[PDB]
Amino acid sequence: HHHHMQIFVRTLTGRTITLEVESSDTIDNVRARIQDREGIPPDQQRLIFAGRQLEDGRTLADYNIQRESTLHLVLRLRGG
Amino acid sequence: STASSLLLRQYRELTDPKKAIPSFHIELEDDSNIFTWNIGVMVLNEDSIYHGGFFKAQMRFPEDFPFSPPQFRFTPAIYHPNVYRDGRLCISIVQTVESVLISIVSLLEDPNINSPKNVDAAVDYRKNPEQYKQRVKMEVERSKQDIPKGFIMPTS
Amino acid sequence: GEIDESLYSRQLYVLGKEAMLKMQTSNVLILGLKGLGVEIAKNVVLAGVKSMTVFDPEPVQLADLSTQFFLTEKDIGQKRGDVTRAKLAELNAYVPVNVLDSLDDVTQLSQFQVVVATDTVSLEDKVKINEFCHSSGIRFISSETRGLFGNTFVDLGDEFTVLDPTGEEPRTGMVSDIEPDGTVTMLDDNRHGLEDGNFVRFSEVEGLDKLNDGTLFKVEVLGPFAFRIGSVKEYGEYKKGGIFTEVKVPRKISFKSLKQQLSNPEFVFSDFAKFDRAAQLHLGFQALHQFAVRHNGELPRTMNDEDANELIKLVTDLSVQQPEVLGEGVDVNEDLIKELSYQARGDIPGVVAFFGGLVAQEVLKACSGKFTPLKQFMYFDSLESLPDPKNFPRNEKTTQPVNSRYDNQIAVFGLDFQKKIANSKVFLVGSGAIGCEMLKNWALLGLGSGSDGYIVVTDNDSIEKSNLNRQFLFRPKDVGKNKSEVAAEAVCAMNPDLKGKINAKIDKVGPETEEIFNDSFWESLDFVTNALDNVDARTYVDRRCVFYRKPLLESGTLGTKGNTQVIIPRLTESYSSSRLCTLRSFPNKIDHTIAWAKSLFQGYFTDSAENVNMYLTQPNFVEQTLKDVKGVLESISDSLSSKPHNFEDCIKWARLEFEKKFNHDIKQLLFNFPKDAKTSNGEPFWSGAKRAPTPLEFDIYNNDHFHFVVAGASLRAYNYGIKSDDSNSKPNVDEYKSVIDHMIIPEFTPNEIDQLVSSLPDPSTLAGFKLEPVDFEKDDDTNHHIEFITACSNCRAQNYFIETADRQKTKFIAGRIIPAIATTTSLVTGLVNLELYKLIDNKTDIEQYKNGFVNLALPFFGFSEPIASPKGEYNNKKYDKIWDRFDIKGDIKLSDLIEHFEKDEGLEITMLSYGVSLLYASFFPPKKLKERLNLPITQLVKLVTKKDIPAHVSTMILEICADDKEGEDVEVPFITIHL
Ligand SMILES: Nc1ncnc2c1ncn2[C@@H]1O[C@H](COP(=O)(O)O)[C@@H](O)[C@H]1O
């Protein structure tokens, strides 16, 4: 319930960025935070955690993302 | 070569039991070819329809890695809107194996129905959902024959 | 109006059909046949002009043999033009080469279209001739080379229109939004590629109805993903769709006479690092002619200071006459003019080959008008090629002539430096177009002619009659012989000094021939020069040069574009450290339908036969295939079910596949996703990169539908060994029509594996039955290979509303043919030899070397400093990521190898591989560890690969991953196991 926590995010080129966030932050809020730090347009990349595509409407606590977790960045359109 | 050297560093990072992702069981073909990987795809998500499955696949890296995208093929082929009848799946283009494999399990639960390859599975995903779930559940159970002996898989 | 597309195949893809037809109606006159003259004449004759005429009544001197490859010691005394015309006509039987005897009356220039004046024409005569050409509409082009310097002049008359500026394909792309202010927004993650000043037409714009009529709009680039065309409020409002195509508008450019340009020149810079030296050399080359007038046609003496100081005065006197050249407040740069006077008598092959190809391309633009011509002037120098005076000093004694053919080369570098060039041991990989130009320049340099040097050239290919256009060392008499062997004897006739010094081999460079090119071969060489055409071989030679720490001179051309790369050990990076799928399903360009048709051509006539040939010859194939299975079993079932008997059955199979691939599968796709289908978000399914297809109704009178059946039937008949009375050169429509009009075509209706494995007949049923798989050949025009891919691709193009392509355009995309013109090949080869001068001095200053990039279409010349090899570190120990490696002596054991790395290097070896074979891994189970930890490196490879290391192998390259003293992975060099 609103506990501070830092999480890691892996990019496509196996590079890890460290972010300081809270469980009361939406994925869209976090996705916009990775946008300004890496340079990727918002439409090109999404976020996957333990094989779960994070929707922009939910928050970090909605996906049971505790402290020192690792997010993953994947293209939005990648199907054959 | 800069291709075999790059493949080694990514093969050790995905098979070291300290950094290994529990969602994929990676082993080399004949334990000697670095450019041919036998990967076992597992969906650990409990709410997913593909839960409990072990879908065997094969990755073949070309000689011009990473300047050419590698091929990914399900053996055997699975029912998915983004998988050809040949079992193969298009890999797009600086990219790592970890990003590609994670991109694959993400497509398994959220298929890109707008750009379909199996038109049968695509029309079944949206128009006949009950039939698509039945084809996947039957596909997951037939996958249990492709388990080795002694392997345990947690949720973690 | 016919063009030999068998001889000019690679050249037609550069110049086009229309431009080559104008070239075949233009008579070219070249004045002066020194090294620069014969280099221009060779490339122009090879390019195929209507007629070639040369004029040079001067007697052949031994010093002229410095750059002219068509002169021998036996020709000394006779006229340069007469002895060269014979050897020039041999290059192209379609181009007659004549000799103009006396140019006393200038009215003889009226029968020519392009006049070329080389260095043998005085500046006073160049102006007299240009005044007659400019006032008569004749194109005038001049050029001269002074040592390591040179320039060129272009005057194409007072009226010249550039219809095509670049010769490239017009850039096109899809539009996602057109704002009312004109901001044309592209689709997601697509770059328009346009630049300011471009012009574009529009298509498929739903709402701006008057925007699609073909009116052109000026492009104002806002960013890499958008451009602006002005307010489009008059045309309506944007809804969806849109495809823009760049259109090249004509540009009528006006030229000034040579007299006008000497006073107010317009420069085109060959190197922006030396863009100030342009106006300096403009007065220097003029002063060289004033010096010749004041000295009875004499040039400034070699390394002479009295003449060099007089030239500086003439340049200063000219600066007062022409104050616009240098401009106000800029000094004369006496040091530059002094170097120009020192080399005024030099004849450098690298500079001649450079300007020879450059001016020749300007002659081609003069006859065809295909590219953008040179804007009135360009100057170029390669002063960085001069060796260090501390090792090879230059003065009036070292650079004096020695009564040899290299006198004009010694005049620049000195006698001691030319001896080292002759004592160099070089390796030329490939004897193609670049290799032929490479051996010619090395023959003029005398490279390898010394008692300590040699030349090794290897090429496993033979000479063909079609290659005689792009390979000028070969003649019709040599077709069928080996490329490297004939090119060896070709240069020995130009310079007999190389006789017995060229080792011509016919062996392919690769891992297959590591016994022939062993350690003793590579280590004895000084440097290696690449003359290859494919990337697979280039990377191997590059990885070999990195292993043995030898310099590599890399080059390559693509049409009018070309580049050079210098690779220095321990200093710069190598050539390896530099530089769809969905599109087949939803095509929007002709490239995607060809890739779809090319893959269909493989599964029809190549993969189906290999599966049947293996199902019949391997008994366990059914059980072996279980390790794609349904597609393979279906391929063998369809290949043995509809087995054709005569050629009439093959026509039926091709017509049925036409209905399946282009009518039924399209209706089945349109059944699941109609033209009005919508996605989850409510967006139209068929939008943007996706085009709603339409089913094809077969029409035998449609050229693409007809040839899909002819080629499809002829190729299937080749698989099943069926022959026909039809002519393989001309199919008859009425015969194919009576066969199809009597067929019953099934209508369309919308739609485990152990059953399939039981439907296959036994191999014993078909005893001796063999299918002949089709081996794809792009260069044969009678095997129906290109006929199928062209017809099949255009049919799918008709489905998705893509514009069809002809055979020549499809052969280009399918075969991945690299265009090659003779002008860029000679120019690029010259730049390689100018860097070769820097390899002889063993220069280590990275700024002295220069990587070149040329685009003769603009024309653009740019040079960049080579990139230094990236450095890394482990345990605070810096190393070179490209060149550094670990040297281990003896066939060490795996256990002692890890011990040597934890003690001497502090690295815990976690993995170890040998080529493409993984040998050791720290995460192996204790069973795999103890088994391999006690084996040496040679026995470790035998255990893993089941193959023995041959006795001719003396070294082994091992890739390793290791952790530092903190337990984290760190990049480390590779290992060389010295057996
Ligand atoms: N691996 C190789 N070994 C020997 N020669 C080669 C190799 N690859 C290409 N070549 C030669 O390189 C030449 C290609 O140059 P070009 O004719 O200009 O395309 C031909 O003579 C080929 O036979």
Author numbering:
A (entry chain N): -3 to 76
B (entry chain J): 6 to 98, 118 to 180
C (entry chain I): 12 to 590, 599 to 646, 650 to 773, 797 to 1024
Copy text verbatim from the article accompanying this structure deposition.
E1 enzymes function as gatekeepers of Ub signaling by specifically catalyzing activation and transfer of Ub to tens of cognate E2 conjugating enzymes. During E1-catalyzed activation, the C-terminus of Ub is adenylated and subsequently becomes linked via thioester bond to a catalytic cysteine residue on E110,11. This is followed by the recruitment of E2 conjugating enzymes and the transfer of Ub from the E1 catalytic cysteine to the E2 catalytic cysteine in a process called E1–E2 thioester transfer (or transthioesterification). Previous structural studies have shown that Ub E1 is a multidomain enzyme in which each domain plays a distinct functional role in its three catalytic activities of adenylation, thioester bond formation, and transthioesterification.
Using an approach that involves the generation of a stable E2–Ub thioester intermediate mimetic and covalent trapping of the E1 and E2–Ub(t) mimetic active sites in proximity to each other, we here determine the structure of a S. cerevisiae E1(Uba1)–E2(Cdc34)–Ub(t) complex. Inspection of the resulting electron density maps validated the placement of the eight copies of Uba1 and Cdc34 and revealed unambiguous electron density for eight copies of Ub(t) from the Cdc34–Ub(t) thioester mimetic into which Ub(t) was manually placed. The final Uba1–Cdc34–Ub(t) model was refined to R/Rfree values of 0.203/0.246 with excellent geometry at a resolution of 3.43 Å. The ATP binding pocket of seven Uba1–Cdc34–Ub(t) complexes harbored strong electron density into which AMP (but not the β and γ phosphates of ATP) could unambiguously be placed. Much to our surprise, two distinct architectures of the Uba1–Cdc34–Ub(t) thioester mimetic complex are observed in the crystallographic asymmetric unit, with the differences largely centered on the positioning of Ub(t) relative to a fixed Uba1–Cdc34 module. In four copies of the Uba1–Cdc34–Ub(t) complex Ub(t) adopts an open conformation similar to E2–Ub(t)OPEN structures, extending away from the Uba1 and Cdc34 active sites where it engages in a network of contacts to the FCCH domain on the front of Uba1. In stark contrast to the Uba1–Cdc34–Ub(t)OPEN complex, Ub(t) adopts a drastically different closed conformation in the other four copies of the Uba1–Cdc34–Ub(t) complex in the asymmetric unit, projecting backward from the Uba1 and Cdc34 active sites and engaging in extensive contacts with the front surface of Cdc34. In both the Uba1–Cdc34–Ub(t)OPEN and Uba1–Cdc34–Ub(t)CLOSED complexes, electron density corresponding to the isopeptide bond between A141K of Cdc34 and Gly76 of Ub(t) and the disulfide bonds between the Uba1 and Cdc34 active site cysteines used to stabilize the Uba1–Cdc34 interface are all well-ordered.
